[PDB]
Design a protein around this ligand. Structure first.
Ligand code: MVJ
Ligand code: MVJ
Lengths: 546, 546
């Protein structure tokens, strides 16, 4: 039975193929058909291109050899190469035009998700051109989704040499009949077929995937839309900054470009942004996904006042100072959403742009105590339940698996009634001991949250709700201000507490505010509608944040 | 006796002052003298500018108020403001022209080095302009050198209000006669003088520093050139990436911009780059200063083969992959310098540019065993001493303080003779039990190295020298290649092992190679000549790396 799938890069995982561009170049320059492909392969195993593919020479060293082969071929064909003929320009364009064949990558991803060991086996070169970063980015984006990447120029062997196929089998630790091998070059399929591997000649992707689906018995075509790439905690770069003697902030970091600081809500983790992290980094941003103070690997001091907005914001500024960042885009959700609005109001110089998911910006009312304000809306009753130190900690810490499975549910998955939490004696008094698992999470994702919360529990997280008076006094200082830096408010149709209507008067305070709105989306925006969150965030970042 | 020094920002730590630019603007526009400064201060404590300085409103909210005050003042003076008059353009230019007053900052730095608590006390605003990042960068660069930053718009008080001076004294935890206060605004000096603080009216920097030097009894003028800013380990962002199950790599991270990966030598630390980290980040780079494999907080597996160049380079590639970096500039010193040349030869797509301090690029000789090659040059005898597992570990681990004090010495500080190490029975057989401290390091810096080496000792570090045959075979694969990506070789005049002459034939392999050369510089380049290293590296990064 098949357990491994091997894909070629050029003409399989990336389109168009180099041969295709050489063919299009020949036509545009009115050169004899096959002239450039002949010069490219000239000398066969003894030729310049085999030396390049085996890593003997670099791409810049190969360019004049390809030039001479083109002159030699033109001379024999009794044709003239044009006056401006340039192998460097021809190849720069061919490499630059290449894009990931998204349906092929999705099929590779589906097979790995079903237990297949996947690999990329490619005839490639040591690219030392000034423009090499283009290819470097393409390889990075592709390679992360595979168990192995075998490159001809790193192993000193090329397809169709029998040895590279033996090297592949040794790397896979699989026998030939357990492997399916996809290639757009027929001659490169022959040695894999000779060993007894299942082989697919890729012309059009749809037919290649049809053959792959039939042979594996795994559906690869006509599948439901896949979710964005997630994060494996053990594969991330974990960063740690001490903001003050007893406070260290943990974050996960991915990508290059402008700094984008992700701020989770209650009771969450940097892991709540798992579907956003890879997508934002791929979009050209340096993502900093925080464990907010009181959570995960960040410090969790016991004192209530350590969690007031003024203290938390000052620490986020120190966090930037210590990392040597003049600014970051701040994106927040729930309590994180509140923090980012305050970051925009008090430290606009340090905030490149601000975005909130679900949490509206509501000015403090100087004529009413925040306790009275919270009492006015029945959906906020849970916030009063959270006031008494120890009460909510006991209930939430009792059974962590039950806590997360009861909380992390989509809007149509029998969500907890937020009505009369105090009167009922707790959040889970009408909830089962063993809740069903939401479609939004796997059992392993729930256990990740359970492990994170075993470190510090719910004291620090709950203290975020215990500074109403202190936060109100500090917010009153900002009442004459407006938020005039780039801002985005994203409402979720089915968030029954942070209702879209609560955001209705935001333009009075944030006149240039941009909006996003997600239909059929509950409170847990990032994991409920990850693809939609990603599209909204990336479109806004690219237009308003740089 | 004085123990604290307080500096104003505008006209003291940053030049020119806003008042100065308003004055120059008045002249250029042929407006009445003082018209703009009058409009700026209009209404005094009740005015628009006091509201702005107290954080009541942001800079963008204030701009139309300043416009109206300019119209009101022009009307009363019976003059016309020009057709294109723009407060936004006037202020953007004034803020943008402001640069750090380097002699004032150096004096502040010298005072803090002598035990003074230092602070910045400023009448400032909440800057929400599109161009705010300029000011954000200036504040970041300045604030890091001080114990405190007190900003009017964050405390809701302004100079010359008596309360802000009481707030200052409370923050300093100092009595008025213990404080020296520098300001370019006479009216803002009066309340500090009234409390009993020493006050200096800053006009020209030289005279202000003369008064400051006389009053503190600390030399601030005509001082020897200061060293670049260093790093406090506890103030850095510490990053951790698992490259494989048993291997994690630790790094320190600072700044934004293109990724610059710093690779130390033997027997060093990320801390060997302390004088480069702040300077490169200030120069607009994202610095990644590694603890190389076998060192500090990075993993130190016992196996020799874990430290061959092929394995180390593959791990550095995985390190980039996991951080989501397509490239980094690689800068190496000693063993790090060797690694970066191999990174350039084997993975040019991932290397933006390559630089080495002291370590030349020498191709492998396929006609001679590396053991024979090492035996040919007497200065490399210590490398043969390093071969036998356990021997050098015992000697180097015996007394860590003695190891580092004997090794870390400038070329004119009785450096160890590298001649006949094997025959002598060790590196320290002719060295004292208690070596004197080199002028390059403090006792506390030596103890930092002692603490780092107590974790894993010298096995992992020494294994870097125990892969001669394996590295030679792998390097032989690259013999047909040339390094064609941007490259810099920095030679040190007085490095008695890695002599400048050893780099003489590098152009045969790296034709476009750029060079740097440091006179009176020994092996420990980064700490021996930090200012010179910085100038060479920054000039090269800005011209050749982007
Ligand atoms: O729609 C919502 N908004 C929303 C907002 C907040 C919360 C809190 C309540 C206290 C514990 C942490 C989560 C829950 C929800 C729901 C309603 C209840 O089911 C989960 C989602
Ligand atoms: O000039 C040099 N180059 C240079 C190069 C390497 C080393 C090694 C030798 C083995 C232990 C680690 C350092 C020492 C030096 C010196 C000569 C000896 O004094 C220190 C500097």
């Amino acid at each position: 039975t098949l357990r491994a799938a091997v894909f070629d890069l050029d003409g399989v995982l990336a389109l168009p193929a180099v041969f295709g561009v050489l063919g299009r170049t020949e036509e545009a320059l009115a050169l004899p058909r096959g002239l450039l492909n002949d010069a490219f392969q000239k000398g066969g195993p003894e030729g310049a291109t085999t030396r390049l593919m085996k890593g003997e020479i670099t791409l810049s060293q190969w360019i004049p050899l390809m030039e001479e082969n083109c002159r030699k071929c033109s001379e024999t064909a009794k044709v003239c190469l044009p006056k401006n003929f340039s192998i460097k320009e021809i190849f720069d364009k061919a490499i630059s035009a290449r894009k990931i064949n998204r349906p092929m990558l999705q099929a590779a991803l589906m097979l790995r998700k079903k237990g297949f060991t996947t690999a990329i086996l490619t005839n490639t070169w040591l690219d030392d051109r000034a423009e090499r970063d283009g290819l470097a980015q393409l390889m990075c984006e592709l390679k992360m989704h595979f168990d192995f990447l075998i490159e001809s120029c790193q192993v000193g062997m090329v397809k169709p040499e029998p040895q590279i196929y033996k090297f592949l089998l040794d790397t896979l630790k699989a026998s030939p009949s357990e492997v399916v091998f996809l290639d757009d070059i027929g001659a490169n399929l022959k040695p894999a077929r000779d060993l007894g591997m299942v082989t697919i000649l890729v012309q059009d992707t749809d037919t290649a995937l049809k053959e792959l689906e039939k042979v594996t018995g795994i559906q690869l075509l006509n599948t439901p839309a896949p979710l964005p790439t997630s994060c494996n905690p053990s594969d991330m770069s974990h960063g740690y900054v001490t903001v003050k003697p007893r406070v260290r902030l943990h974050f996960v970091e991915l990508g290059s470009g402008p700094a984008v600081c992700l701020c989770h809500g209650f009771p969450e983790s940097w892991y709540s942004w798992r579907y956003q992290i890879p997508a934002l980094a791929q979009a050209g941003y340096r993502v900093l996904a925080m464990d907010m103070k009181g959570y995960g690997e960040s410090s969790a001091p016991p004192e209530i006042e350590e969690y007031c907005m003024e203290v938390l914001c000052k620490e986020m500024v120190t966090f930037l100072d210590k990392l040597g960042l003049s600014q970051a885009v701040f994106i927040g959700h729930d309590w994180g959403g509140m923090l980012v609005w305050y970051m925009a109001l008090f430290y606009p110089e340090r905030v490149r742009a601000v975005a909130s998911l679900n949490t509206p910006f509501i000015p403090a009312n100087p004529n009413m105590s925040p306790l009275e304000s919270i009492k006015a809306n029945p959906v906020f009753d849970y916030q009063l339940y959270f006031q008494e130190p120890g009460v909510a900690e006991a209930e939430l810490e009792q059974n962590l698996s039950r806590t997360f499975k009861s909380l992390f549910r989509a809007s149509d998955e029998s969500v907890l009634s937020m009505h009369k939490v105090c009167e009922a004696g707790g959040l889970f008094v009408n909830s089962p001991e063993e809740p069903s698992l939401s479609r939004m999470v796997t059992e392993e994702e729930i256990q990740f949250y359970v492990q994170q919360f075993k470190k510090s529990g719910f004291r620090g997280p709950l203290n975020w709700y215990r500074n109403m008076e202190r936060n109100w006094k500090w917010a009153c200082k900002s009442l004459g201000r407006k938020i005039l830096i780039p801002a985005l408010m994203v409402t979720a149709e089915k968030d029954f507490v942070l209702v879209p209507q609560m955001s209705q008067h935001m333009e009075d305070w944030i006149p240039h505010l941009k909006r996003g709105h997600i239909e059929d989306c509950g409170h847990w925006t990032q994991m409920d509608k990850p693809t939609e969150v990603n599209q909204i965030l990336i479109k806004w970042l690219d237009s308003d944040a740089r």
